[PDB]
Structure formats: C-alpha cells, structure tokens
Amino acid sequence: EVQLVESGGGVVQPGRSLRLSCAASGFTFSSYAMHWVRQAPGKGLEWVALISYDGRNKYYADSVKGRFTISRDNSKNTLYLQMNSLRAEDTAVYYCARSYPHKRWLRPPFDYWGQGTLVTVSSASTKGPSVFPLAPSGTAALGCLVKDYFPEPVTVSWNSGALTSGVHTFPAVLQSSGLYSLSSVVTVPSSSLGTQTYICNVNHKPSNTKVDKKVEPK
Amino acid sequence: DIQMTQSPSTLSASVGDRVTITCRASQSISSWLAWYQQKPGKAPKLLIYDASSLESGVPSRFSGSGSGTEFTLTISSLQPDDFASYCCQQYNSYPVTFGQGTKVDIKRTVAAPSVFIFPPSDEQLKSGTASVVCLLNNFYPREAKVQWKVDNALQSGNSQESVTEQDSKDSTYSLSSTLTLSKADYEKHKVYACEVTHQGLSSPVTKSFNRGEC
C-alpha cells in the first residue's frame, strides 16, 4: 500500500522561502532514491532534484541549483525540499516520486508519486474579491463576476448549495495586474425570474471575505 | 537536455475505441522511455516503462512501442477509467525530461453553444472599470473561437477566457470570455458584440447589446 503525501505548499512573495515535505509509507523508504518533480500551469513535468537512499548524493536541476536543497530523514520516512530565493517561475505543483527499484537512480522512471502540493510565488498581496452581478438580460442565464482577488482559491455556491443543476463556475484567470478573476453562471427558466431569488455565495478565506450578491433582472 | 515532443495535444475517443499517442525524442533514447497517466487532483501513475513493459497490474489494453527517437502508447479498447491525460518521459540521459501531455476526453455528438452576453454592472462602472462577459454554454467539441467587436471594431489583447472541464453527465464544455475596458472608453462606444464560431453552428452567432438607448 505505497503512499506518498506531499505538504508545505503555499503562497509566498519573490525571494522568500518554503519547505516542502513528503511523508512516505508502505515501503522501506530508506532503501529508495527519491525525487522532486514539478508541473507549472500549462506546462510539462520538470525534474527538480534527487537524493540517494542514504542521502549522500544529491543532484539538482540547473534552474534551481544554489536555491533549493533536497534532504531526507530516514527514521521519519520523510523527504524534504527547502526552497529560498523563490521566483515567480517556481510556481508549480510539486510532486514527490520514488525511483524505479533496480533502475539507475540518476535517470529512472518513477513508479510511485504523491498527489502533489501547490507552490505559488507572486509579488501580489492578499486581497478579497469584488462580486458583481451578471444580470439576466425560454432559458435565461445569469451569474456573478468575482473580480480582483488574490490568492486562489475562492469557492462560489448558489442559494447556499440548494441550486446545483446548470451551474458553471469557471476556472479563474490571472489578469495583467496579478489578481485573479472568476465567473460563475447558471441557466434557469426565464419564467422563474422574480419567483426565485438567485444568490451567489462567494468565500475567499485568505482574505476572510464572504459576499452574498443577489442577481436581479436590470 | 533531451527534448520530448508529444502529439497530438488532445484527442477525443469513445468507449471501445483504439487510441494512439506518440512521443518523439530530439535524440534517440534507445528504449529508455516511460508512460504515465494523470488525472486532476490525483497522483500520476506509471503505466509503461522501458518503452514496452507494463507495470504490475496495469490493464493489458495498454501497450507501448518504439525505439530510438519515436514512441507510441496505444489504448486498444478504451474504458471509462482511461479518460485522463498521458505523458511520456525519457530516462536515457541524466536530466530526465517529459512531454507536454495528451488529454483524452469523451466523444459525443456535436452540440452548438448557447451564447449570452452580459454588460458591466452599474456598480462596477462606478469603480472606473468595465468588464463585458460572453458565455458559451454546453457545447462540444471543445474547440471554439470567441471574437469581441466594439462598434464593429475587432478587439484584440483585452479579453481572457476560461473553459470548464467536461461535464460528467452530458460531456459538454462551457466557456466564459471577459472583455476589459476602462470606464472612459466603455462610455465612448455603443454596441458590444461577441461573435462565436463553432462546429454546431452553420454560421457564426453574434450576441450584442447597445450600451446606451437600453
């Protein structure tokens, strides 16, 4: 029952530090070379670093050399990635991966991975969103625009979770300003407008912002 | 580092289909190539290593082939669990490298988008900013072009869009496009239009509003 569980990801500003952990279970961790691999938004997987079974040999990708340090605690079945001097381009999901057993640890396939932990490096600062109605103008669409917030994520529900069918909450896009913007829409029977009230419930926990915006015909 | 080029970027398939994804290497990697399966929020999974060997317990409907510089992953009788992304990896030489990935989505009949346009709210115009939203609802396939027009003037560089994941029940997508202008420039013009082209439409659909006089 091999399992790898990464933790420690978060949102920081350029130049700062983050320590990632990966807890391993279900195998003799101390007999395997271990790796970190990362995947930036909309890009391919990129190998970052590796460490030998006994922690004596470590190798690093050129893009992180001198800024990251891979390490391991074999008595705790844990692998670590300490980052400092982080850059925007270090933003990625970071994966812990096991080196294929009898394959050269320097260039192996990886037979087990974790679910990953997300690292976000940005000069933006925490900010709650503005929520604006997308007013409906026999099927009618309406929604809420969740603009200018940082960092991810926000959650949007409709009618406190009572309204689920026909709801589409879109992935946020990152604007020029460095802030996110998201839209959430729902289609309803034109004839229901005025009968049901429609409320997007918006929550951005990083800024402790909760907004309930009611959407009216204009 | 060895560059790995995967093709195609995406493909659609039905259950029972035979699906082929290729990966090419900038220099031969002999047979040192692995294939992985990736699903959102889950751990990557090793399917095939050494170009052709299946990992223990991997279903035999997966096969791998190739040697040198060109490589093939084939899923022969695709099953519902196989809708996912797939990436190759070389381990011939030290910095291991991966392809960009290939997404396999569910095939269905063509479905035209229902299009809606939303003017900026008066509360937003207060801020000094105008966001105009165009919604393309429940269409297939994923490929769609959204074109913003302001008093017939083609817009470029001032819009962003995002697309949902394929819907579990009806296998469609929806798309949101946002056009951003200053409040000053929004008030300079009258007609805001999003023109949508898609396979489900015999001809492009335009939805518009007239800023004033409404």
Residue numbers in the entry:
A (entry chain H): 1 to 137, 144 to 224
B (entry chain L): 1 to 214
Provide the authors' own sentences about this structure as they appear in the paper.
Previously, we generated a human IgG1 antibody, Ab25, against the M protein of Streptococcus pyogenes, which was opsonic in vitro and protective in vivo. S. pyogenes has several virulence factors, of which the M protein is one of the most studied due to its importance for virulence. It is a cell-wall-attached protein with a dimeric coiled-coil structure that extends out from the surface of the bacteria.
We have previously found that the Ab25 binds with both Fabs to two different epitopes on the M protein, so-called dual-Fab cis binding. The data obtained by protein cross-linking mass spectrometry was supported by experimental validation showing that the single Fabs of Ab25 IgG1 could barely bind to M protein compared to F(ab’)2 fragments. In this work, we generated all four human subclasses of Ab25 and observed that the IgG3 subclass had reduced binding to M1 protein compared to the other subclasses. In addition, our in silico data suggested that IgG3’s weaker binding to M1 protein was due to a loss of Hbond formation between Fab1 (binding to C domain) of IgG3 and the antigen. For the MD simulations analyzed across all three IgG-M1 systems the binding of Fab2 to the M1 was stable for all three antibodies, while the Fab1 showed a transient behavior and was most stable for IgG1. To better understand the binding stability of both Fabs across all MD trajectories, we extracted the network of hydrogen bonds (Hbond) and salt bridges at the interface between the Fab domain of IgGs and the M1 protein. This analysis revealed two stable salt bridges (E44-K58; E46-K65) formed between the VH domain in Fab2 of both IgG1 and IgG3 and the M1 protein. Moreover, we recorded a set of eight Hbonds for the Fab1 domain of IgG1, whereas only two Hbonds were observed for the Fab1 domain of IgG3 and IgGh62. The analysis of H-bond showed that IgG1’s Fab1 has 6 amino acid residues forming H-bonds with M1 (D54, R56, D222, S249, N313 and S314), while only 1 was formed for IgG3 (R87) and 2 for the designed IgGh62 (S123 and K127). The differences between IgG3 and IgG1 in Fab1 could explain the reduced binding of IgG3 to M1 measured previously. Nonetheless, our analysis suggests that the network of atomic interactions between the antigen and antibody Fabs can be altered when exchanging from IgG1 to IgG3 constant domain.
